[PDB]
DNA sequence: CACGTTGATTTTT
DNA sequence: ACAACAATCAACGTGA
């Protein structure tokens, strides 16, 4: 499979984009009770339930923008450090501090997911997200849990007074589904294997990573196109129609329904579509990417090339 | 003023008739707000597939079930009068039910626009409202003689 | 002629058909002498005046103002205005600074007067704007801050001298620049924003040229 | 459908406009958290609520003037590059630098959306646009979300002391609607397919496009006319009055109300109207334009001839 | 209405003024951020706030002289080209170059709005216009908006260096209203329909038409007259006093307040007033004129007659 | 009323009556104007239908449940040993409620005309001037008290 | 008064 | 980047 797709990508990163988008269409299913918050409450929004049918107003959870890009991004940086292409020690020439004046201006993270410093310059991200919405209503997709913080003595008292360290937190339930489209602008084959690698290889999301927030990203399709397809919300609304407003159904059924909705929607977009990897061809592509990421020599080669390509981009078009 | 000044009483003053944690214990925010916490959870946790009065009567069913876990020092309607259990328990249950008429038909139904999202982005804030209101009443009632 | 041949001219074409536009601008408001010096710098594609230009264009402003009370007051005010912020901020001209870096406190004073609603008091503007000056100064490097860089005196007294130096400058902007000169009207300040800025850059360079001589 | 409209367009770009305006009436529906800003807050202004019945003042959001011509323009340029009509490499004969001296002055962006720098002169935009306003009130249409930047250690205090970078930003909610009338002055048929292309094919708006700000452009009419029709604010105010201010309505009913307000407003405008494509004629127009943009052999011909026309305009009337 | 109004006009254009002014009383309401500038800032002037009661000084915005006649003039010219009565191609016998030699000296623009370049003399504008003033103060009536221009790569750097392409511009807020009287001398009835057509059919005014500056002209009266009525500033100072400076009133109440102050002022003018079209008679006449400008036969006939009238004036008294 | 202008000195003195830190500690800007930062957050965040006193109880609790999260060195009421600790709070929460009425009435209502868009555009100035007024008063007080 | 007719200067770091 | 304007405002001679 991947042997054919090498022909669709740029041979080196271009100066300006030239409409070679790849779109990853995936459902992000919750395991282990996520927290997506900003101001101490779960993020929720009133929304239209569907498109054509199901016109009623509905509160749904939102995975607000950075909360789905930055777990992916940091899991990529971790792999670059593990393969030894970048370093965390401040004595090294290939250091890459995450967000600060010390941040690199030439590693794959910086050139794909973008950076700003001020002095050195800046680089707009080549990977495009948006905030993602629960397919179900919030009322049936959350629960709030109490937490307490006693002494090692097994009590809330140390002098016969109470310490009063008790509060509650609002948690997303398991099997709650966020449909998402992630998009990549004018990447190389190696830049594709890196960001796709992140989507598959990142498992923990949102607040309290140490304790919660594991998610099962099922990739539903990959679509190569001259331009941008539907929003996360338009996919969520189209999928609530096809799900008949009756979301209490299996994960494999929801994944195949999303493949059918994605293809029904793609035919209504004013974009050329060079390839549409869905169904058995995507299970063949996913397996050929899993082979790359399990094989030590091959992963080092691919991602090593990327470092060169991003170094070339940096020295020829980027922050020099 | 009346239509939401009376709510700035009733949001705590209608639960003070059945629940009072003594503020001198310096108890948690969670421990003071316990009636309202379990009302706002009942109100966020279900769609309109049943009536506002059904939401009131089931929510009354939650608080009368939950407060059997709290120690009896919390319940003035049991402490402050001496009368048979099945009658003080009916006085408790109907005091809980009128508190949820405020919570459902005025606090949710009018002040939170009647829409669960506009409650949900506010639940910490209207909790901090009840937190101050409970102290504003109780610390005056205790200390105004100084 | 030496002001018209700086601005409203081309190197082979003196454009004497525009001398009536150059004189009417000089007479209407004396700070236009510095607005024209900046246009000449723009044509000549030179980023800063020579040391000679900083005293030439000032002796011209003092010459054309000589008989007029409101012009001599505005030319004395634009010097005083900069001589006040130069008590708490000094970018060294040797480092080849930008016109913006020279005008950091005056640009943040004027933007405050112009951005607030017209209802708010002079004594509120003085406090909000001095907050923005304190906030800006603390983001520059320590060598630019004459009161704080001088380690000789106790830290709360450096803070106390900074706060009262920022307050007296902001009081001159809101009372005398805006309230008296610009009639307390933001429209009349908006027309002048450009020539007040040009006049303050020439004032800053003159105060610096005078300091570097007399410090001997 | 498109086979009948080819009669109404100019056969090549005219020197001076001869009053052949195409107007695109559309609703820009928010999909995910746009940031429409200048000077660091969501741009907002006071307006009358609606024209005649609801006459109270109402603060509404403003999608300021360029914020809806640039995403369209840049999605158009990327297609010209994708078809190979223009290029990004500084050595090529067909380079078009954005915002610079090295603008082409003879490609479709340059002729249709205009240019200004350098000796070869300027050209006024043939796409006409105005700032667009929220149908609803600002207080009902925005939320502010706080954000932070931990060190990759997963802490806020790498020095043993906090970064203190915690801030917030104001975002427009989903399903917020901006009524808009784009306009096009004396184009060719291929110029119409290019501009209608951009409006239908561009998807991202405002700040933080790589993270946020997807939108759904529902074109509700195309009106061919002898002159200028109503302002965006007048369409916003007429539509608010028509809905009686109860704006919590399905997306399709809002598009059907906009279509029936626009036809009643057009009947009160002193312009001869050659054509009024609404309803089923617009559904059948847009599916035919989709089937240009979904097909390579047709698109490359059409946008190719636009190159010629615009190159010809440049060499006969324009920058030479 | 038009059947009676016809009697007031002259049967053909005279060489000398024969009294016979028609005065178009308007409010021009801002709809989308106009820029009215000369010398790089919004034009403003200090004025007394109102005639009798509120006698304090105030700065108000100035829609300076030609900013309210060039939009009218050019919109009439593109209609003359649309109707085919004039052309923009060199080597056509009905060419009319705007503001050059090769001006027609026979078309309705040349006669009604005047000419002064080259041989064959000069002609005074029969439309008399004046600079208009904002009813409110500058401080309540404007805002400054930052604009920037990044590279197409989405950042302010192309080689690590900054672009620094950042500036402010001031724009007049929506709902800001400019009271004005346009005056037409010695017209034929068809000449009145042309000028009145320009006033109802134009909709953009300021700088940056392509992006900004839509306005709504509400004609509040038409007054047939033996000579000049009041200045724009005087109608403004009367209207501010009648509102007491309480200017946050809806446009319907503001157009009804302008109607009563204009009639109060007209009864204090040393001017015989033959006809005073206001209110219910004016919203009759405005519809009878919309019925001309929406009808292809009626407009061609009328404006074609005007062409003959203006070509006969040209051969009899004008440029021969 | 004339309170449509000149507010900031009254606004800062009203919270300096219950919260302080000395500039000899060299604290962050965010920590000086903490009381005002919680007030402006409460005003701008909650629904536009809610009336003055409902904003006041909420805003009062929204900063009371935050000022007790740090050292008593910063609280110039609760440290006064001259009064019994339960009555120190009776003075304290009535000081919070009068600071909170001047921000909901004078600041938001009069100075910003009650419009959240106007307040949001000017929020950083309304902050920076209260930070400056606080330093100005604190470093004045240490002169006259000696 | 009423017809008709058509050439010239030298230059502003 | 780049324009600061553009035109027009007799002087005779000859015959009736």
Residue numbers in the entry:
A (entry chain D), D (entry chain C), E (entry chain B): 1 to 320
B (entry chain K), F (entry chain J): 1 to 146
C (entry chain I): 760 to 975
Sentences from the paper on this structure:
Interestingly, the type I-D system utilizes subunits that are homologs of type I complexes, type III complexes, or both. The type I-D operon contains the type I signature gene cas3 split into its two domains; the helicase domain (Cas3′) encoded from a stand-alone gene, and the HD nuclease domain (Cas3″), which is fused to the large subunit as part of the core effector complex. The Cas10d subunit is bigger than other type I large subunits (Cas8) and similar to type III large subunits, yet retains the type I functionality of discerning PAMs in target DNA sequences. As is typical for Cascade complexes, a repeating, helical backbone of Cas7d subunits assembles around the crRNA, while the C-terminus of Cas10d and two Cas11d subunits constitute a minor filament along the belly of the complex.
To obtain mechanistic insight into dsDNA targeting, we employed cryo-electron microscopy to directly visualize type I-D Cascade bound to dsDNA with a protospacer sequence complementary to the crRNA and flanked by a GTT PAM. We employed focused 3D classification to overcome local conformational heterogeneity, which yielded a structure of the dsDNA-bound type I-D Cascade at a global resolution of 2.9 Å and enabled de novo atomic modeling of the entire complex. The stoichiometry of the complex was Cas10d1:Cas7d7:Cas5d1:Cas11d2, highlighting the addition of one Cas7d subunit compared to our recent sub-nanometer structure. We resolved 43 bases of the crRNA scaffold in the Cascade-dsDNA complex, as well as 16 bases of the target strand (TS) and 13 bases (five of which we modeled as poly-T) of the non-target strand (NTS). The unwinding of the dsDNA duplex occurs between a cleft created by the bottom Cas7 subunit and the spur on Cas10d, which we assign as the PAM-recognition domain (PRD). At the DNA duplex PAM site, we observe a loop from Cas10d wedged into the minor groove of the PAM duplex. One glycine (G433) interacts with the G (−3 position) in the NTS of the PAM, providing an anchor for the loop to lock into the minor groove. The K326 residue in Cas10d recognizes the C (−3 position) on the TS, the T (−2 position) on the NTS, and the G (−3 position) on the NTS via hydrogen bonding. In comparison to the ssRNA target-bound complex, the dsDNA-bound complex undergoes a continuous 5 Å shift of the small subunits away from the belly of the complex and slightly downwards towards Cas10d, along with a similar shift of Cas10d downwards.
